[PDB]
């Protein structure tokens, strides 16, 4: 049922093999870039901490802080430029190799299907594409991140690295389950409606018989009995997916708690420094998470090898009216909006707790007081994890249940109005998709906006309180950091121009295959251009995350040295603003097209009021 790993790439020529080799080297280099970033970040933290401790000591009785921070700005910018180049080459070369091979495969498959099966020519080649393209570069980049992170961890601190080893299996498993849930989310949504979509298609295809025999009140009940099961499956999915991702968040925050309790123990015993702790922790944790994230790649490669089997065998042989739709679910919406506020407000709460536990180690104090404060802040990390688990689950569950109730109701009354009466394909799409997207204009929009406000608005407010000069500087790059998060999630998710050439294939010798070949030219060139365009977009938004470090901490060195701020405040502002922009991007990448959703709702309301 699957082809060979070597036989998968039999249409690659010398240029494609070169693209793969150089794209894999660039992937290794790109993946090695975040652990080196954490190494540099730890050294910078230690510079700041030592300066702060010495100033605290000599209070009653920062000279070189800016000079020392220029070098680290250079290191940050160098890693950022290297990552820019390497990410560009990786993404670009892997997309180009995949595109050239998929083009040759499409042409060969249509030549062979006629030298002698439409799904095998439309969707199976797309499965091969999804398998042999970006995902392989992702996989090598994530393997490099894992290995480099663990090398940096063991070289900087093996004791703390071992303590985080004890946890890394669960972290990689959480990341794997998370990424798999994200990958298969829409497929499961389409699969739940399968049994009711069959009834819908078979009734709408024989509508004359139905309204002639008067079986409207019975086909409605068949559809309803299947809609109940679709809704139950949707509720179960809303429970399990959200409980899994909430458990992942809880595990991340508990890892913070544990690693920082142990690391602060090692720092108070004099054996480690706080920058050393930061380096080890962030390196090992990000590596362990990257491993998990690299499992959709293996699933996709296996699916590509599965899809290539058949092919190669053949070849070889009003927003207020819309909201009023979902009005009876105001309890779910109240609970969900409350939970979305509490969920968004966890990024600034984390910024505060993190900056405080690190600022404990940037000024001198009694060892007993330092132990007490470190214990308190580790406990606060754990409490953050518990709260995030609960609120994430509740937000997801309430909004998903309201969305399921609304979808079932909309499908039901849409079918009832079609029966109390426009091709059958259009009607089945109105029932399968248009009814399932009206929730995107209500609950999804509400959740995304509430969470993003409670996150970035609160972050920016407390950042203006703690350090307004740095907040003003970082506000200029907030849009690019948010877009970086959006682009990164779109790149991980792997997210029409072939429909024109689907006609020449659906119709069907040499002339037909020549017409098909000529029809493929425009989408071929479009994909070859999109490869470069997306490579450069991704690489630039990735490098901006590295340049944010340089800018923020050079200006923070200036401010700390001139006494306008402390390193704890610089850390708080960095965390809050920068990673709240990143979280805003990551959350907004789950919001559906509000325009398409309003259009779907308009069509649904037309059909219902007809």
């Amino acid at each position, epitope marked *: 049922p699957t082809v060979s790993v070597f036989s998968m790439f039999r249409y690659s020529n010398w240029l494609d093999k070169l693209y793969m080799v150089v794209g894999t080297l660039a992937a290794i280099i790109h993946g090695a870039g975040l652990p080196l970033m954490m190494l540099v970040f730890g050294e910078m933290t*230690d*510079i700041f901490a*030592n300066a702060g*401790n*010495l100033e*605290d*000591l*000599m209070s*009653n*009785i920062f000279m*070189n802080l800016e000079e020392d921070m220029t070098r680290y700005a250079y290191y940050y910018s160098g890693i950022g430029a290297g990552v820019l180049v390497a990410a560009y080459i990786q993404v670009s070369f892997w997309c180009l190799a995949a595109g050239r091979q998929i083009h040759k495969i499409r042409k060969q498959f249509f030549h062979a299907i006629m030298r002698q099966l439409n799904t095998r020519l439309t969707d199976d080649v797309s499965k091969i594409n999804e398998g042999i393209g970006d995902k392989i570069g992702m996989f090598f980049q994530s393997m490099a991140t894992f290995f480099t992170g663990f090398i940096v961890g063991f070289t900087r601190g093996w004791k703390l690295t071992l303590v985080i080893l004890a946890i890394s299996p669960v972290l990689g498993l959480s990341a794997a389950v998370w990424a798999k849930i994200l990958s298969s989310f829409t497929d499961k949504e389409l699969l739940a409606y399968a049994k009711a979509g069959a009834v819908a298609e078979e009734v709408l295809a024989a509508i004359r018989t139905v309204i002639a025999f008067g079986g409207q009140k019975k086909e409605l009940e068949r559809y309803n009995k299947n809609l109940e099961e679709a809704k139950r499956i949707g509720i179960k999915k809303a429970i399990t997916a959200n409980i899994s991702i909430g458990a992942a968040f809880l595990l991340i925050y508990a890892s913070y708690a544990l690693a920082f309790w142990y690391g602060t123990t090692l*720092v*108070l015993s*004099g*054996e*480690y*420094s706080i920058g050393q702790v930061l380096t080890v922790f962030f390196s090992v944790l990000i590596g362990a998470f990257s491993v998990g994230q690299a499992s959709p790649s293996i699933e996709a490669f296996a699916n590509a090898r599965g899809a290539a089997y058949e092919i190669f065998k053949i070849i070889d042989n009003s927003f207020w009216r819309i909201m009023k739709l979902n009005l009876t679910e105001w309890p779910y919406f109240v609970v969900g909006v409350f939970c979305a506020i509490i969920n968004g407000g966890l990024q600034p709460a984390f910024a505060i707790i993190f900056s405080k536990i690190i600022g404990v*180690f940037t000024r*001198i*104090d*009694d*060892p007993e*007081t*330092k132990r007490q404060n470190s214990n308190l802040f580790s406990l606060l990390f754990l409490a953050l994890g518990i709260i995030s688990f609960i609120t994430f689950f509740l937000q997801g569950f309430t909004f998903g249940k309201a969305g399921e109730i609304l979808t079932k109701r909309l499908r039901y009354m849409v079918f009832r109005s079609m029966l109390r009466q426009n091709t059958t394909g259009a009607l089945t799409t109105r029932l399968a998709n248009d009814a399932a997207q009206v929730k995107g204009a209500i609950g999804s929009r509400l959740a995304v906006i509430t969470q993003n406000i409670a996150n970035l608005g609160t972050g920016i407010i407390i950042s203006f309180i703690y350090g307004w000069q740095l907040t003003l500087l970082l506000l200029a790059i907030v849009p690019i950091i948010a877009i970086a998060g959006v682009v990164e999630m779109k790149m991980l998710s792997g997210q029409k121009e072939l429909e024109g050439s689907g006609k020449i294939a659906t119709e069907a010798e040499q002339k037909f295959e020549h017409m098909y070949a000529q029809s493929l030219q425009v989408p071929y060139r479009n994909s070859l251009r999109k490869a470069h365009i997306f490579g450069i977009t991704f690489s630039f938004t990735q490098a901006m995350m590295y340049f944010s470090y340089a800018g923020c901490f050079r200006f923070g060195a200036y401010l700390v040295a001139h006494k306008l701020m402390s390193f704890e405040d610089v850390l708080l502002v960095f965390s809050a603003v920068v990673f709240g922009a990143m979280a805003v991007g990551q959350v907004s990448s789950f919001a559906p097209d509000y325009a398409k959703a309003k259009i779907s709702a308009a069509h649904i309301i037309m059909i219902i009021e007809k």
Partner: antibody, heavy 122, light 111 residues
Framework: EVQLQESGPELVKTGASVKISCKAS????????IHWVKQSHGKSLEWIGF????????FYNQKFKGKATFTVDNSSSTAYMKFNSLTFEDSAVYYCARLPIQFGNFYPMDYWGQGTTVTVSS | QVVMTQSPLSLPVSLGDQASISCRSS???????????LHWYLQKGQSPKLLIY???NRFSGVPDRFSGSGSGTDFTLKISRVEAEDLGVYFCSQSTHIWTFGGGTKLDIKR
């Protein structure tokens, strides 16, 4: 074990210079200051200053500024104190002690060197 | 500069008996954070060893014979049973206002 091995006894000519060392072993060198303390015969100990074993930032007692100079070799984990224009009043025993950087003066000098006697004679 | 004064410059003791060494600062050693940073070291051509720190906390690996008390500008180090590995020079150290040390007290065998 934490150990601070100091160099050996030194007999110096008046007006010359001598550099004495404190080799640390058994702990993370760069998380501590090395303080230098002087003891003349029949007098109380006297703090000279300290140097940071992380970046080499020094602080000198006002009586000793210009008279002594602290340096640090982070590779060998040693601290040095050098005198200039030694006079007879510098005949004394010199100790090194370590202090955690994280706690500053909110902690004792827990480990000391064994002392280096310096006899300035012409 | 805080001046630290040790009352007995020499303390004749007897093996097995008790000993008490006093220290007095020219200014209160209580810090604004509620702690008093007074430490006691023993010196024998060896390195000084920390015995007591922060008035009364015994250092790691120090026998139970050594105990410390005192409040402000008046502190004491008591040795409950003077063994033979205790004859040396005990000196106090403050680190509240900053480093200054006490003059030292030599334990001598009484006869």
């Amino acid at each position: 074990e934490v150990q601070l091995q100091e160099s050996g006894p030194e007999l110096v000519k008046t007006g010359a210079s001598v550099k004495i060392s404190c080799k640390a072993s058994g702990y993370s060198f760069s998380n501590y200051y090395i303080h230098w303390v002087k003891q003349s015969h029949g007098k109380s100990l006297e703090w000279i200053g300290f140097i940071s074993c992380y970046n080499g930032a020094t602080f000198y007692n006002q009586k000793f500024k210009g008279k002594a100079t602290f340096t640090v070799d982070n590779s060998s984990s040693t601290a040095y104190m050098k005198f200039n224009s030694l006079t007879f009043e510098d005949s004394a025993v010199y100790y090194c002690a370590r202090l955690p950087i994280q706690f500053g003066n909110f902690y004792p000098m827990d480990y000391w060197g064994q002392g280096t006697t310096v006899t300035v004679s012409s | 500069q805080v001046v630290m004064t040790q009352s007995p410059l020499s303390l004749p003791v007897s093996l097995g008996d008790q000993a008490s060494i006093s220290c007095r600062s020219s200014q209160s050693l209580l810090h604004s954070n509620g702690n008093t940073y007074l430490h006691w070291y023993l010196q024998k051509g060896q390195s000084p060893k920390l015995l007591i720190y922060k008035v009364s906390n015994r250092f790691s690996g120090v026998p139970d014979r050594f105990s410390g008390s005192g409040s402000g500008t008046d502190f004491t180090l008591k040795i409950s049973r003077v063994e033979a590995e205790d004859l040396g020079v005990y000196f106090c150290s403050q680190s509240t206002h900053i480093w200054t040390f006490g003059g030292g007290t030599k334990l001598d065998i009484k006869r």
